[PDB]
Design a protein around this ligand. Structure first.
Ligand code: HEM
Length: 291
């Protein structure tokens, strides 16, 4: 299984900036979503989910084929809630119909992070829509009620080491859990939508109480009103992870750089980029374009 990247016919960087801008402008506009959190968070989640299906052993899954668009993938229970990101992106694809889905789902995540003040994420186009046949079965996404070994194990499937993992988890500083979607509740009830190293700080400085929630699942609840899933908490129970957490707790820059590299890698897993491929583009934010 090879997936070679194929640039959308005749498109160039400027063509992609525009898609980016459209998404960005729309995020700005639709600020009421989920109690005023914005779609930032949800788009980040989408991009990681259409990407975490990848399986380094047989090259199946991954963002290339934009299979999230098919029922089977779209109905993935681990996918609950994601449908709102999709509906967000809808009209945008309608405006730029030559962009493939994998390119769009992925770019939304990128636009998201950056417009939330994250670090820039270099991104490459070229993903190709593949047939329904190629949709991976459900069940390739991680559960949250496990520990550090699980996490370590799970992520190896995607080629990520300790470091990538901890860095990537820092997206957890964003948005929130929704009982109806996954069985977790919190945080109570004003969330964050600015990308900072806030996750690691919360992990180290709060007084976590393990509790069961209304759905019968365990979660770490803090006085201040924050929450962390078991998989999250586990980052502090493992010796190796713990030191990286601390590192990120102390230097947002380091965190941003590693986050950037890992998120890109994550979004490119399984794709093969021909030699003559264009370099990765680095999008300008609205602000930088004075829009
Ligand atoms: C062990 C790995 C992980 C597990 C089990 C996991 C599980 C979860 C859970 C259960 C949700 C809450 C869903 C809800 O009720 O709406 C969630 C929220 C989300 N996850 Fe993850 N997560 C992990 C990895 C990732 C990674 C790598 C990313 C991004 C880089 C990420 C980004 C987020 C985002 C942004 C949200 C908040 C979404 C919202 O506000 O709607 N998580 N994650």
């Amino acid at each position: 299984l090879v997936h070679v990247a194929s640039v959308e016919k005749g498109r160039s960087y400027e063509d992609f900036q525009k898609v980016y801008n459209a998404i960005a402008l729309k995020l700005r506009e639709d600020d009421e979503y989920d109690n005023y959190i914005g779609y930032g968070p949800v788009l980040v989640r989408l991009a990681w989910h259409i990407s975490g299906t990848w399986d380094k052993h047989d090259n199946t899954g991954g963002s290339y084929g934009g299979t999230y668009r098919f029922k089977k993938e779209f109905n993935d229970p681990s996918n609950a809630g994601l449908q709102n990101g999709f509906k967000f992106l809808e009209p945008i694809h309608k405006e730029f119909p030559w962009i493939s889905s994998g390119d769009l789902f992925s770019l939304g995540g990128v636009t998201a992070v950056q417009e939330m003040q994250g670090p820039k994420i270099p991104w490459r186009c070229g993903r190709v829509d593949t047939p329904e046949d190629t949709t991976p079965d459900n069940g390739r996404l991680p559960d949250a009620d496990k520990d550090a070994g699980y996490v370590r194990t799970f992520f190896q499937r995607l080629n990520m080491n300790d470091r990538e993992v901890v860095a990537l988890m820092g997206a957890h500083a964003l948005g929130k859990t929704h009982l109806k979607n996954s069985g977790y509740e919190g945080p109570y009830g004003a969330a964050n939508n600015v990308f900072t190293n806030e996750f690691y700080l919360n992990l180290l400085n709060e007084d976590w109480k393990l509790e069961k929630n209304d759905a019968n699942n365990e979660q770490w609840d803090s006085k201040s009103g924050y929450m962390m899933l078991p998989t999250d908490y586990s980052l502090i129970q493992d010796p190796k992870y713990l030191s990286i957490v601390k590192e990120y707790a102390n230097d947002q820059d380091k965190f941003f750089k590693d986050f950037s590299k890992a998120f890109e890698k994550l979004l490119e897993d399984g794709i093969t980029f021909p030699k003559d491929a264009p370099s990765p583009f680095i999008f300008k934010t609205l602000e930088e374009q004075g829009l």
